[PDB]
Structure 1
Amino acid sequence: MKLILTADVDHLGSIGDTVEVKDGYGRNFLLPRGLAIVASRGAQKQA
């Protein structure tokens, strides 16, 4: 699943860049901790 992240994650990206991740790292670690959101409209709220 692809994510527009909000914090800084080592080995994954800086703020705001969209990146696809292995779908268990998304819903278990980056989404409950608030470090990312989905990529459906935030690319327009980043651009």
Structure 2
Amino acid sequence: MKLILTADVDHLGSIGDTVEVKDGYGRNFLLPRGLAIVASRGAQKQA
């Protein structure tokens, strides 16, 4: 899965851009803390 990261994550990306992580990092650190969301419909909102 691909996460659009709303927060700024060091050596991982800035606001808004989409970045793919190895699925444990995302669901155990990024989604719980609001750093990223899963990319389903957010591309239209960003663009």
What is the CA distance between 1:38 and its match in structure 2?
Answer: 0.4
Gaps in structure 1 of 5+ consecutive residues: none
Unaligned stretches of 5+ residues in structure 2: none
SS of 2:3's partner is strand
TM-score by length of 2: 0.94
1:46 CA displacement: 0.7
Cα separation, 2, equivalents of 1:12 and 1:44:
22
Q: What are the within-5 Å matches in structure 2 for residues 1-47 of structure 1? A: 1-47=1-47
Count residues with an aligned counterpart.
Answer: 47
* CA RMSD, 1 decimal: 0.6
